From a paper:
RNA interference by type III CRISPR systems results in the synthesis of cyclic oligoadenylate (cOA) second messengers, which are known to bind and regulate various CARF domain–containing nuclease receptors. The CARF domain–containing Csa3 family of transcriptional factors associated with the DNA-targeting type I CRISPR systems regulate expression of various CRISPR and DNA repair genes in many prokaryotes. An atomic structure of the apo form of a Csa3a homolog from S. solfataricus (Csa3Sso) has been previously reported to harbor an N-terminal CARF and a C-terminal MarR-like winged helix-turn-helix (wHTH) domain. Here, we identify cA4 as the cognate ligand of Csa3Sso and show that Csa3Sso lacks ring nuclease activity in vitro.
To better understand the structural basis for Csa3Sso ligand specificity, we determined a 2.05-Å X-ray crystal structure of His6-Csa3Sso bound to cA4. Like the apo Csa3Sso structure, the Csa3Sso dimer is domain swapped with respect to an N-terminal CARF and the C-terminal wHTH DNA-binding domains of the two protomers A and B. Overall, these data evidence monodisperse dimers of Csa3Sso in solution that persist in the presence and absence of cA4. Consistent with in-solution dimers observed for Csa3Sso, the asymmetric unit for the Csa3Sso•cA4 complex structure consisted of a dimer of Csa3Sso bound to one molecule of cA4.Figure 3 cA4-bound Csa3Ssois a dimer in solution. Comparison of all the cA4-bound structures of CARF domain proteins revealed that cA4 in the Csa3Sso–cA4 complex structure exists in a unique elongated conformation. In this conformation, P1a and P1b (called distal phosphoryl groups) in the cA4 ring are stretched outward (with a P-to-P distance of 11.8 Å), which brings P2a and P2b (called proximal phosphoryl groups) to a shorter P-to-P distance of 4.4 Å. The hallmark of all the adenine-binding pockets in Csa3Sso are π-stacking interactions of Phe14A&B and Phe10A&B with the nonplanar (A1a and A1b) and planar (A2a and A2b) adenine rings, respectively. The inward-facing phosphoryl group in the middle of the elongated cA4 (P2b) was found to hydrogen bond with highly conserved Arg98A&B (cA4 binding motif 2) and Glu122A (β5–α5 loop) residues in Csa3Sso. Of interest, the cA4 phosphoryl interacting surface of the Csa3Sso pocket is largely positively charged except for the conserved Glu122 residue that hydrogen bonds with cA4 central phosphoryl (P2b) oxygen via its side-chain carboxyl in the protomer A. Such interactions of Glu122 side chains could create an electrostatic repulsion with central phosphoryls (P2a and P2b) likely constraining them close to each other in the elongated cA4 conformation. Also, the active site interactions of Arg98 and Glu122 with the target cA4 phosphoryl (P2b) results in an O’-P’-O” angle of 94° presenting with a stereochemistry inconducive for nucleophilic attack by the 2′ ribosyl hydroxyl.
Numbering used by the authors:
A (entry chain A): 1 to 191, 196 to 212
B (entry chain B): 1 to 211, 213
Write the structure that this text describes.
Amino acid sequence: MKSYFVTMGFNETFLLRLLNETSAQKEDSLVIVVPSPIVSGTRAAIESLRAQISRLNYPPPRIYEIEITDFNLALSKILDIILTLPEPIISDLTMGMRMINTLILLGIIVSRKRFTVYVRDEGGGSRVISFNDNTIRALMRDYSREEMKLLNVLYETKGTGITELAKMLDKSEKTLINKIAELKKFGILTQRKVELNELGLNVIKLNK
Amino acid sequence: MKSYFVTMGFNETFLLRLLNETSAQKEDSLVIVVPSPIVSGTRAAIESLRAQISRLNYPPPRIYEIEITDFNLALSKILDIILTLPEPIISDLTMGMRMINTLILLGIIVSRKRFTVYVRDEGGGSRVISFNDNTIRALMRDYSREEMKLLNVLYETKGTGITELAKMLDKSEKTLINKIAELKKFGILTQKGKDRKVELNELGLNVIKLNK
RNA sequence: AAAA
């Protein structure tokens, strides 16, 4: 099971593409936040979506309409929704008002729940970026000086095997293997040569 | 001095509004990052922004272009720019590609720099909302056991006086008054009502949602 | 939907 958590603009096909591409199930949660009042273009898009859910075996969407007066009051309503959603939360920030998308994104990040976010080229095509809760945790984690010395050696060597890495770092092979396991769980390196990935390069840039 | 860090679409209007709202000075840094190659509509928006800036003692913009291949490669480009920026950073996420704005927002957050974000109604309305690095700090702060007790009692009472709070938490009035002064300044507490009850403010009500 |  899955949740979808989006805000609707005037174009339901962004969401239909998301539901189709991530194999939406009838039993998933589909929650759509809209501003108050719901304007004519948004109502048409939601009603068009509703006219497809039976044919496509999708859940009926649950619409939340929210007044936006300031950041914190609106974030409270978004957080209330988020904290009830089954995980993972699937989000696609390509659709709907930027104010609400900003709330959704900050909300899912500070909630610490599991999520995947997509952001695409609005005008279509192939450009797309994506990230998840593990991406954000890795970038926001506090790294010890010993961890940073490990990562910085990997940055300099562009990859080293465990045996040679242990000798270079003056670490037990047993204790280095445990740290490598702890760090790959954050998704910042790969492996019997250990190597940084792109996310690990960003970690190094933040802790320089 | 402060810095402005935005992207740009086909319209300079929202950025000019932000510069007015946030008291832009000619010595501020204005940095604009755009997708490569710079398309015609964006070039026209930048040229129109420059002409308007020259009237108004605003900071002249420095332009960066980036390729967007994937999240981490593009974030590295954004981080490189961010680390050149004097603090605090001001951004408005209502202009330009959503992909770039998402990277700007995530970049300034994980850079741990001081920043303020504005984002506005883009479809005809007038509402603008705002948050800053202290917003994120307050929501993700590791509150102590004693701090959590205080925050939860305030939530459960919907606000109460210092004297009552000190009894419920088994503390002296003096030490509680000092903690409450600290968290008012930090920005999560207020003393509403005519009876001087202490309560969570709008930000504190979000903090408590993430902390029991 | 680079101003839902």
